[PDB]
Amino acid sequence: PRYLKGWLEDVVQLSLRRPSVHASRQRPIISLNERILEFNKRNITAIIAYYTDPIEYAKYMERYAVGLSIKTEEKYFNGSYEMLRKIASSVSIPILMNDFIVKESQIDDAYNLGADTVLLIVNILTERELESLLEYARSYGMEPLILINDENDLDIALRIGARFIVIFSMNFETGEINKENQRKLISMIPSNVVKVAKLDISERNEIEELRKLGVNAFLISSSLMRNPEKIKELIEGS
Amino acid sequence: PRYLKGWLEDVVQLSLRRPSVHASRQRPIISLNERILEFNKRNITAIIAYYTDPIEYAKYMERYAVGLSIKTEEKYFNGSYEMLRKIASSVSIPILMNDFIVKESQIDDAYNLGADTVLLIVNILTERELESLLEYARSYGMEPLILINDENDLDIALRIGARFIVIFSMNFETGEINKENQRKLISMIPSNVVKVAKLDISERNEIEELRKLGVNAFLISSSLMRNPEKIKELIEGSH
Ligand SMILES: CCCCCCCCCCCC[N+](C)(C)CCCC(=O)O
Ligand SMILES: CCCCCCCCCCCC[N+](C)(C)CCCC(=O)O
Ligand SMILES: CCCCCCCCCCCC[N+](C)(C)CCCC(=O)O
């Protein structure tokens, strides 16, 4: 990967050592990106539920969300592989594995655990690595969601042929999104790319303008909320 | 302008020396790109008639075309400023003045002759010139149609904030379009740009699939045909 600083370098160092799992999947892959496209056709707002017990939430969100985002990074985000595997086997909507993917065995894990795609982060990989890991996931039938954070990220993402892009424009220190830069990046992205905008639930009212801007789906974090129904009702009312 | 070679250099040097005109516009701007979006909303195929007796042709296509393109380049395309004024004073659908625009006075000419927008061509202009002519056209209420011919063109147009793009991908000596590169370029354009594809009338069967790729309108040349009813009926049939 890249040679970074601080906690990002630590989580990169740790992820490079992530032991792979013995596991086998319960169902075939459900394409997250194509389901988003089918939600667009049917004029249903496509929201990836960004989860931070987890089985209860996944059960509730299954009837409403276009897909589920499950954190598996262990040191800084309290995730686990077993959590993912349990969620993936008892739900039948696409599961996105959310982690710091730096080697091919992590894509094996995601696949063997029941995930339907994985997150790739341009800003921690070389261009060579990103194309190699993008093609490795596709070998399993997984179009990964590629996280872009700035213009250079997007240049690389389009050069290697990414079809599934999530736009952050976030400071990896604080965690705040520059909405202005996010809008910019979204507007530079080809229309044959499935575009996902990262939001917090407090900015839920930006959804409609972002749709008109070309956004196909939304990766929505619910901050400190714990009640799936209340999360869902707050999304619904906007 | 950029440095160029062949006939393209010649027409660009001729255009730098194009005398301006002093006419008075006889009706307000009718926005071509918005009318295109109106047609999209109504599921009416939007086609810009690429005219190539012209007043009879214009009066006839006014009922069906989303807009008209009139050539005003004089030496190679047999166009004239006076033909543009007479057509524009006679139909009520948007008019596109198609020329080699390298200076602001030509945009003045378009406005004063009654055109509703202008063509700008990425590959004959520097980036600064193109951004400058873009805003000057916008000073009159003309969102120009920006012509892109390759990926470097498209990169420059999206950076300056082109909202209205026509995709050619044409060998500028022969006039032949690389069809699969035209489709590549179409798909590289963000979804919120109004997209126009150049077509020959013999390619009218590609319209539906081009709509599916995200194309909003079609700049259709009718080749050698001389009967405007036959031209319309040939397109009417293929839908
Ligand atoms: C798998 C999902 C991708 C999103 C992860 C983005 C990372 C940015 C979030 C901020 C993380 C901040 N923490 C918790 C590590 C604190 C570190 C603060 C610091 O830089 O000093
Ligand atoms: C090359 C010159 C192009 C002139 C534009 C001719 C368009 C022909 C359309 C004929 C109108 C037929 N209508 C009345 C049924 C409308 C068609 C509806 C549709 O767009 O499918
Ligand atoms: C006229 C408004 C601009 C539209 C874009 C022009 C593209 C046309 C390209 C085809 C060029 C064909 N020609 C005949 C002009 C070249 C031959 C000139 C010559 O050597 O006689």
XYZ file of C-alpha atoms and ligand atoms in Angstrom:
540
model
C 0.000 0.000 0.000
C 0.943 3.669 0.335
C 3.232 4.803 3.174
C 0.966 6.955 5.352
C 1.065 8.602 8.781
C -0.751 8.169 12.071
C -3.696 5.866 12.718
C -4.217 5.261 8.984
C -0.686 3.867 8.744
C -1.380 1.769 11.826
C -4.620 0.319 10.459
C -2.835 -0.325 7.153
C 0.010 -2.129 8.912
C -2.550 -4.167 10.889
C -4.732 -5.022 7.887
C -1.719 -6.368 6.014
C -1.543 -9.037 8.759
C -5.291 -9.887 8.745
C -5.494 -13.689 9.059
C -7.742 -15.248 6.470
C -10.726 -17.363 7.568
C -11.914 -20.866 6.825
C -15.535 -20.354 5.813
C -17.934 -21.083 2.970
C -20.878 -19.044 1.736
C -24.603 -19.815 2.038
C -26.001 -18.133 -1.104
C -24.837 -16.769 -4.471
C -23.724 -13.182 -4.931
C -26.412 -10.504 -5.055
C -25.053 -7.577 -7.080
C -25.273 -4.388 -5.013
C -24.556 -2.036 -7.929
C -27.159 -3.641 -10.214
C -29.763 -3.575 -7.447
C -29.113 0.156 -7.099
C -29.758 0.474 -10.843
C -33.017 -1.470 -10.507
C -34.031 0.763 -7.585
C -33.415 3.796 -9.821
C -35.674 2.340 -12.555
C -38.467 1.687 -10.047
C -37.991 5.199 -8.607
C -37.172 3.866 -5.123
C -34.528 5.852 -3.256
C -31.512 3.546 -2.932
C -29.902 3.750 0.514
C -27.057 1.568 1.777
C -27.619 1.206 5.525
C -24.286 1.993 7.210
C -24.228 -0.047 10.419
C -21.797 0.805 13.227
C -27.061 -6.605 18.308
C -26.296 -6.236 14.570
C -28.554 -9.117 13.477
C -31.676 -7.255 14.667
C -30.752 -4.108 12.736
C -29.971 -6.147 9.609
C -33.330 -7.926 9.900
C -35.210 -4.627 10.174
C -33.288 -2.777 7.429
C -33.706 -5.721 4.990
C -37.168 -4.611 3.830
C -36.076 -1.017 3.146
C -32.381 -0.702 2.293
C -30.831 -1.301 -1.093
C -27.922 -2.962 0.762
C -26.098 -3.226 4.077
C -22.635 -1.933 4.962
C -20.898 -4.059 7.612
C -17.681 -2.972 9.317
C -15.125 -5.777 9.731
C -12.049 -3.771 10.815
C -11.269 -4.825 14.379
C -9.071 -2.226 16.099
C -10.660 1.135 15.234
C -14.223 0.196 14.259
C -15.159 -2.714 16.595
C -15.949 -5.097 13.718
C -15.489 -8.819 13.219
C -15.572 -11.469 10.523
C -18.079 -13.596 12.503
C -20.477 -10.638 12.778
C -20.381 -10.282 8.994
C -20.849 -14.009 8.374
C -23.910 -14.171 10.639
C -25.484 -11.087 9.069
C -24.771 -12.288 5.544
C -26.358 -15.708 6.018
C -29.614 -14.468 7.603
C -30.284 -11.591 5.159
C -30.915 -11.713 1.403
C -30.053 -8.184 0.316
C -26.499 -7.297 -0.828
C -23.918 -6.991 1.950
C -20.996 -4.573 1.482
C -17.876 -5.528 3.435
C -16.406 -2.329 4.845
C -12.727 -2.578 5.771
C -9.228 -1.455 4.836
C -8.543 -3.941 2.037
C -4.827 -4.125 1.223
C -4.280 -7.749 0.071
C -6.112 -10.409 -1.938
C -6.827 -12.752 1.015
C -9.179 -10.116 2.482
C -11.311 -10.425 -0.669
C -11.269 -14.207 -0.204
C -12.544 -13.646 3.364
C -15.318 -11.289 2.230
C -16.445 -13.787 -0.406
C -16.230 -16.842 1.874
C -18.086 -14.933 4.594
C -21.101 -14.180 2.405
C -20.409 -10.587 1.354
C -21.638 -9.386 -2.027
C -18.949 -6.742 -2.595
C -16.071 -4.964 -0.854
C -14.907 -1.384 -0.292
C -11.624 -0.335 -1.915
C -9.968 2.918 -0.860
C -7.882 4.664 -3.510
C -6.006 6.846 -1.014
C -4.269 3.856 0.694
C -3.337 1.883 -2.445
C -0.982 2.318 -5.347
C -2.593 2.474 -8.765
C -1.123 -0.938 -9.590
C -2.571 -2.381 -6.365
C -6.025 -0.842 -6.881
C -6.399 -2.300 -10.390
C -5.100 -5.660 -9.153
C -7.516 -5.775 -6.199
C -10.365 -4.428 -8.350
C -9.796 -7.250 -10.844
C -9.363 -9.789 -8.049
C -12.782 -8.952 -6.631
C -14.342 -9.060 -10.110
C -12.922 -12.595 -10.444
C -15.419 -13.527 -7.705
C -18.178 -11.564 -9.416
C -17.826 -8.579 -7.033
C -17.789 -5.077 -8.462
C -16.130 -3.348 -5.483
C -17.240 0.063 -4.270
C -14.266 2.371 -4.757
C -13.901 5.230 -2.272
C -12.649 8.504 -3.755
C -11.635 11.461 -1.605
C -10.256 14.005 -4.073
C -9.535 14.711 -7.734
C -6.389 12.556 -7.857
C -8.358 9.639 -6.397
C -10.929 10.061 -9.180
C -8.299 10.248 -11.959
C -6.892 6.936 -10.762
C -10.346 5.398 -10.280
C -11.441 6.199 -13.854
C -8.051 5.244 -15.354
C -8.305 1.696 -13.998
C -11.951 1.401 -15.077
C -13.909 1.540 -11.828
C -17.668 1.102 -12.325
C -18.819 1.543 -8.700
C -17.714 4.701 -6.873
C -18.551 6.183 -3.464
C -17.734 9.855 -2.956
C -16.532 10.969 0.492
C -14.372 14.160 0.345
C -13.708 13.631 4.044
C -10.819 14.440 6.330
C -9.546 11.091 7.601
C -8.441 12.921 10.762
C -11.636 14.724 11.840
C -14.176 12.799 9.761
C -16.022 15.798 8.309
C -17.080 15.941 4.654
C -16.419 19.058 2.563
C -19.830 19.160 0.883
C -18.529 21.555 -1.785
C -15.725 19.206 -2.849
C -18.110 16.227 -2.665
C -20.463 17.948 -5.140
C -17.519 18.753 -7.430
C -16.287 15.157 -7.576
C -19.794 13.804 -8.172
C -20.150 16.140 -11.165
C -16.914 14.908 -12.794
C -17.977 11.237 -12.794
C -19.134 9.427 -15.965
C -22.841 8.640 -16.176
C -22.176 4.914 -16.792
C -20.565 4.758 -13.313
C -22.876 3.893 -10.424
C -22.353 6.800 -8.012
C -22.821 6.564 -4.230
C -22.805 9.663 -2.010
C -21.680 9.312 1.602
C -24.013 11.187 4.019
C -24.785 11.466 7.700
C -28.453 11.132 8.651
C -28.594 14.778 9.761
C -27.947 15.794 6.139
C -30.768 13.486 4.973
C -32.539 16.409 3.269
C -29.772 16.746 0.657
C -30.896 13.469 -0.952
C -33.183 15.007 -3.563
C -30.707 17.560 -4.882
C -28.029 14.858 -4.958
C -30.340 12.632 -7.028
C -30.769 15.447 -9.555
C -26.967 15.709 -9.593
C -26.628 12.115 -10.882
C -26.294 10.262 -7.558
C -27.741 6.760 -7.856
C -27.547 5.701 -4.188
C -26.640 6.878 -0.699
C -24.350 5.451 1.990
C -26.011 6.917 5.069
C -24.497 6.845 8.540
C -26.931 7.178 11.461
C -24.542 8.827 13.956
C -25.402 7.715 17.503
C -28.909 6.397 16.803
C -29.609 2.827 17.981
C -33.245 2.269 16.981
C -33.575 0.885 13.427
C -37.243 1.864 13.221
C -36.453 5.422 14.329
C -33.567 5.579 11.856
C -35.904 4.300 9.150
C -38.759 6.631 10.078
C -36.430 9.643 10.053
C -35.192 8.696 6.584
C -38.787 8.096 5.469
C -40.120 11.476 6.577
C -37.562 13.442 4.533
C -6.421 29.794 -31.394
C -4.271 26.710 -31.237
C -1.683 26.174 -33.900
C -3.209 23.993 -36.614
C -2.438 22.635 -40.075
C -4.198 22.120 -43.398
C -7.615 23.537 -44.242
C -8.440 23.836 -40.519
C -5.662 26.392 -40.083
C -6.968 28.265 -43.126
C -10.589 28.469 -41.967
C -9.393 29.530 -38.495
C -7.260 32.345 -39.970
C -10.185 33.357 -42.183
C -12.484 33.395 -39.116
C -10.076 35.579 -37.110
C -10.590 38.114 -39.943
C -14.379 37.702 -40.272
C -16.044 41.158 -40.510
C -18.609 41.772 -37.809
C -22.189 42.862 -38.564
C -24.543 45.485 -37.147
C -28.018 43.888 -37.378
C -30.739 44.106 -34.722
C -32.242 40.960 -33.224
C -35.999 40.726 -33.883
C -37.025 38.254 -31.112
C -35.653 37.026 -27.752
C -33.479 33.970 -27.171
C -35.236 30.596 -27.267
C -32.939 28.229 -25.356
C -32.002 25.165 -27.396
C -30.718 23.064 -24.502
C -33.773 23.723 -22.363
C -36.111 22.918 -25.271
C -34.154 19.662 -25.667
C -34.902 18.878 -22.015
C -38.571 19.778 -22.538
C -38.689 17.246 -25.385
C -36.953 14.657 -23.185
C -39.591 15.135 -20.495
C -42.378 14.647 -23.049
C -40.780 11.555 -24.662
C -40.492 13.358 -28.011
C -37.281 12.517 -29.854
C -35.239 15.730 -30.068
C -33.458 16.205 -33.384
C -31.491 19.257 -34.517
C -31.928 19.546 -38.297
C -28.407 20.030 -39.697
C -29.305 21.936 -42.844
C -26.725 21.415 -45.524
C -34.032 26.770 -50.887
C -33.284 26.988 -47.158
C -36.255 29.051 -45.982
C -38.668 26.400 -47.282
C -36.661 23.685 -45.519
C -36.711 25.692 -42.271
C -40.428 26.479 -42.433
C -41.061 22.770 -42.980
C -38.802 21.402 -40.209
C -39.989 24.010 -37.672
C -42.958 21.736 -36.889
C -40.788 18.689 -36.089
C -37.190 19.643 -35.248
C -36.188 20.634 -31.741
C -33.930 23.251 -33.367
C -32.071 24.134 -36.537
C -28.343 24.324 -37.286
C -27.308 26.876 -39.920
C -23.811 27.000 -41.371
C -22.359 30.488 -41.566
C -18.794 29.538 -42.573
C -18.392 30.982 -46.042
C -15.472 29.406 -47.897
C -15.788 25.661 -47.271
C -19.414 25.253 -46.139
C -21.184 27.739 -48.452
C -22.792 29.481 -45.476
C -23.607 33.137 -44.981
C -24.583 35.522 -42.207
C -27.491 36.752 -44.358
C -28.994 33.271 -44.741
C -28.893 32.927 -40.938
C -30.736 36.232 -40.386
C -33.510 35.402 -42.874
C -34.119 31.942 -41.389
C -33.911 33.181 -37.791
C -36.342 35.993 -38.515
C -38.753 33.399 -39.959
C -39.003 30.418 -37.555
C -39.801 30.247 -33.847
C -37.643 27.256 -32.800
C -34.063 27.666 -31.499
C -31.338 28.289 -34.081
C -27.763 27.025 -33.745
C -25.163 29.034 -35.652
C -22.498 26.555 -36.757
C -19.190 28.252 -37.589
C -15.562 28.368 -36.437
C -15.780 30.739 -33.502
C -12.390 32.091 -32.404
C -13.290 35.654 -31.298
C -16.025 37.444 -29.369
C -17.283 39.602 -32.274
C -18.527 36.414 -33.970
C -20.660 35.693 -30.917
C -21.899 39.284 -31.228
C -22.728 38.479 -34.854
C -24.687 35.357 -33.905
C -26.716 37.275 -31.321
C -27.430 40.219 -33.627
C -28.416 37.953 -36.552
C -30.978 36.258 -34.329
C -29.326 32.943 -33.530
C -30.217 31.313 -30.215
C -26.823 29.733 -29.479
C -23.428 29.022 -31.023
C -21.001 26.151 -31.552
C -17.616 26.284 -29.835
C -15.002 23.731 -30.875
C -12.539 22.620 -28.204
C -9.691 21.606 -30.510
C -9.181 24.934 -32.347
C -9.100 27.018 -29.138
C -6.796 27.348 -26.181
C -8.285 26.522 -22.803
C -8.382 30.211 -21.789
C -10.041 31.242 -25.069
C -12.654 28.500 -24.729
C -13.486 29.496 -21.146
C -13.629 33.124 -22.275
C -15.948 32.525 -25.262
C -18.120 30.282 -23.061
C -18.867 33.080 -20.592
C -19.225 35.722 -23.308
C -21.824 33.563 -25.053
C -23.511 33.232 -21.654
C -23.499 37.052 -21.342
C -26.152 37.036 -24.095
C -28.120 34.131 -22.666
C -26.552 31.602 -25.056
C -25.424 28.335 -23.541
C -23.134 27.246 -26.373
C -22.924 23.744 -27.778
C -19.303 22.657 -27.185
C -17.958 20.180 -29.732
C -15.644 17.449 -28.471
C -13.641 15.204 -30.765
C -11.598 13.093 -28.300
C -10.906 12.443 -24.618
C -8.551 15.404 -24.151
C -11.275 17.684 -25.591
C -13.828 16.292 -23.127
C -11.461 16.740 -20.207
C -11.037 20.439 -21.043
C -14.783 21.004 -21.556
C -15.773 19.409 -18.216
C -13.109 21.417 -16.378
C -14.360 24.784 -17.672
C -17.933 23.742 -16.895
C -19.439 22.816 -20.242
C -23.142 22.048 -19.802
C -24.058 21.455 -23.487
C -21.801 19.095 -25.467
C -21.968 17.652 -28.990
C -19.955 14.464 -29.519
C -18.336 14.099 -32.926
C -15.207 11.875 -32.914
C -14.605 12.793 -36.555
C -11.539 12.668 -38.754
C -11.467 16.354 -39.605
C -9.960 15.716 -43.047
C -12.377 13.053 -44.350
C -15.453 13.784 -42.238
C -15.781 10.141 -41.134
C -16.818 9.447 -37.528
C -15.238 6.642 -35.528
C -18.551 5.198 -34.311
C -17.300 3.153 -31.376
C -15.124 6.020 -30.145
C -18.143 8.317 -30.318
C -19.927 5.914 -27.946
C -16.905 5.779 -25.637
C -16.930 9.585 -25.396
C -20.706 9.736 -24.837
C -20.347 7.449 -21.819
C -17.482 9.449 -20.334
C -19.787 12.492 -19.934
C -21.397 13.129 -16.501
C -25.144 12.542 -16.363
C -26.073 16.214 -15.850
C -24.665 17.486 -19.177
C -27.071 17.886 -22.097
C -25.612 15.457 -24.652
C -25.899 15.675 -28.459
C -24.704 13.012 -30.892
C -23.891 13.740 -34.510
C -25.519 11.236 -36.891
C -26.019 10.676 -40.603
C -29.627 9.994 -41.549
C -28.486 6.497 -42.633
C -27.732 5.835 -38.931
C -31.271 6.698 -37.749
C -31.705 3.152 -36.410
C -29.120 3.890 -33.686
C -31.346 6.542 -32.094
C -33.059 4.402 -29.461
C -29.861 2.784 -28.193
C -28.181 6.193 -28.108
C -31.119 7.443 -25.985
C -30.384 4.483 -23.688
C -26.732 5.494 -23.347
C -27.932 8.923 -22.113
C -27.989 11.019 -25.320
C -30.524 13.863 -25.072
C -30.636 15.116 -28.696
C -29.366 14.315 -32.198
C -27.669 16.572 -34.733
C -28.694 14.720 -37.885
C -27.261 15.399 -41.320
C -29.517 14.278 -44.179
C -26.739 13.558 -46.673
C -27.761 14.104 -50.318
C -31.548 14.084 -49.854
C -33.397 17.113 -51.204
C -37.041 16.510 -50.289
C -37.783 17.723 -46.738
C -40.916 15.560 -46.537
C -38.936 12.449 -47.514
C -36.324 13.363 -44.882
C -38.941 13.751 -42.144
C -40.816 10.633 -43.276
C -37.617 8.566 -43.285
C -36.965 9.599 -39.683
C -40.629 9.361 -38.638
C -40.583 5.750 -39.826
C -37.449 4.613 -38.015
C -38.713 5.443 -34.502
C -14.557 1.281 6.036
C -15.222 2.670 5.959
C -14.387 3.769 5.333
C -14.531 4.997 6.185
C -13.372 5.145 7.131
C -12.844 6.544 6.955
C -11.820 6.931 7.973
C -11.995 8.306 8.529
C -12.696 8.326 9.898
C -11.963 8.977 11.042
C -11.218 8.022 11.934
C -10.681 8.743 13.150
N -10.209 7.944 14.256
C -11.268 7.267 14.919
C -9.215 6.965 13.936
C -9.589 8.887 15.128
C -8.179 9.271 14.666
C -7.948 10.762 14.798
C -6.602 11.276 14.337
O -6.280 11.329 13.137
O -5.831 11.707 15.199
C -32.770 15.368 -40.385
C -33.977 16.268 -40.146
C -34.728 15.873 -38.889
C -36.072 16.573 -38.773
C -36.879 16.056 -37.596
C -37.914 15.059 -38.077
C -38.550 14.300 -36.919
C -39.584 13.307 -37.439
C -40.682 13.047 -36.414
C -42.042 12.971 -37.086
C -43.161 13.277 -36.099
C -43.964 12.011 -35.807
N -44.780 12.166 -34.615
C -45.718 13.261 -34.817
C -45.516 10.925 -34.378
C -43.915 12.473 -33.479
C -42.969 11.302 -33.200
C -42.960 10.870 -31.741
C -41.601 10.293 -31.299
O -40.619 11.052 -31.073
O -41.473 9.053 -31.145
C -19.153 24.287 -40.090
C -19.349 24.352 -38.562
C -18.373 23.397 -37.888
C -18.751 21.924 -37.860
C -17.516 21.045 -37.794
C -16.809 20.895 -39.107
C -16.446 19.468 -39.383
C -16.433 19.087 -40.838
C -15.239 18.183 -41.180
C -15.158 17.729 -42.610
C -14.119 18.522 -43.359
C -14.322 18.403 -44.856
N -13.719 19.441 -45.640
C -14.306 19.409 -46.946
C -14.024 20.740 -45.094
C -12.290 19.232 -45.752
C -11.685 19.413 -47.145
C -11.094 20.779 -47.398
C -10.230 20.799 -48.646
O -9.052 20.408 -48.639
O -10.715 21.211 -49.722
